[PDB]
Ligand binder design. Sequence first.
Ligand SMILES: O=[N+]([O-])c1ccc(O[C@@H]2OC[C@@H](O[C@@H]3OC[C@@H](O)[C@H](O)[C@H]3O)[C@H](O)[C@H]2O)cc1
Length: 427
Amino acid sequence: AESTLGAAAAQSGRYFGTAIASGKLGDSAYTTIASREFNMVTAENEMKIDATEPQRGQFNFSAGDRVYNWAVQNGKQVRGHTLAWHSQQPGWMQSLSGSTLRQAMIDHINGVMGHYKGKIAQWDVVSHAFSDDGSGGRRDSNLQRTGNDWIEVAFRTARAADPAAKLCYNDYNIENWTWAKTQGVYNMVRDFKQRGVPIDCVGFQSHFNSGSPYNSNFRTTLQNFAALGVDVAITELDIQGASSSTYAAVTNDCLAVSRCLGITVWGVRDTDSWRSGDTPLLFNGDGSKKAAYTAVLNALNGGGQIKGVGSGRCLDVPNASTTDGTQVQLYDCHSATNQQWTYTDAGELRVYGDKCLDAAGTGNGTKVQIYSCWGGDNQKWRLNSDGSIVGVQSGLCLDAVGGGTANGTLIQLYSCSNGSNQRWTRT
Ligand SMILES: O=[N+]([O-])c1ccc(O[C@@H]2OC[C@@H](O[C@@H]3OC[C@@H](O)[C@H](O)[C@H]3O)[C@H](O)[C@H]2O)cc1
């Protein structure tokens, strides 16, 4: 109830989910991670309009049901995505307009929700309905040109089709409270609640990058929407660079809002991401947990010198050398730059400013040394709550050779054993 993301989130009545791609369900490495870590699933594309209604009036749930069945059979709830929006519309719908388009939208909603009636926890009824031009208004689309009330109609339609599902409005770039787009959505939801329009949740995609960075005020945004009487959900979270601090910050924002139902990251491994170039998820392509994974898990579980517990001595660079390939050791702790390590958001343990704790391989006995920082996974580490420090690439623990405790004891990689020569404390 604390070793996996879903289980850790469940401790506070929340979920931690991911986007599942039906085309990857035959990949054992993929499903092993997905079934183990998440208790909520969103079909990445299988429940969209084009996927569910390829031809007007012709519904197809082959792909959607495969994802839905995999989710339920493996113990995960499901978020339906998405009933009505401008993107990925089938060819036939893109050419529709006015009343006929409005009716098509309604028929689609009834068809899809009817198929999954009572089996979906949340439905993204409408998505991407606002512009990014900075006006805070609706974006120009075929759906919007049929009447400004199309969104309201979609929700009223959805409520009737399946009263058991929570109905959400989902969008991106509505995380920062100071943005006009965020205000546009806020005003609409407030209007809906005041007039009784059936809406139960607001989904924040949370696709963060240096173009639209995460800001601490995201929590305020979540709290402001929660105050309107709707639940909130982080629906498609991914962070460019996967900063451990940022991932932990977003996790704590949801935990700080009683109405935040949970968090879904948009994909399992970076190689499965729609934005793989931004290495924005919690697992590497080879399936290894990233530093960000541990940061998130620690947050969900309610969680300078590096001193070894068994030895009482500090991780030290011999004679304050800055030479690449110098194996680190244990040494009496004292004020010195060669014992001052900085844990970065990328998961590095830096010394001297630009040298990185580096594993010279991946197996037991591998030498741990300092080497120029370059971003390799053999230079990334996960700081566990039990005091162990695990190498991302190797999955092995920082280990004081042979359990030595005296000055000069070298540091190596070794299968984690919870031994005192593998436990560290930082001050
Ligand atoms: O440019 N953006 O900021 C942006 C573009 C699209 C977008 O869509 C939302 O978030 C991602 C969507 O999923 C992807 O849709 C396209 C597929 O080819 C890809 O495989 C999916 O992962 C999601 O459905 C939608 O809600 C947001 C922001």
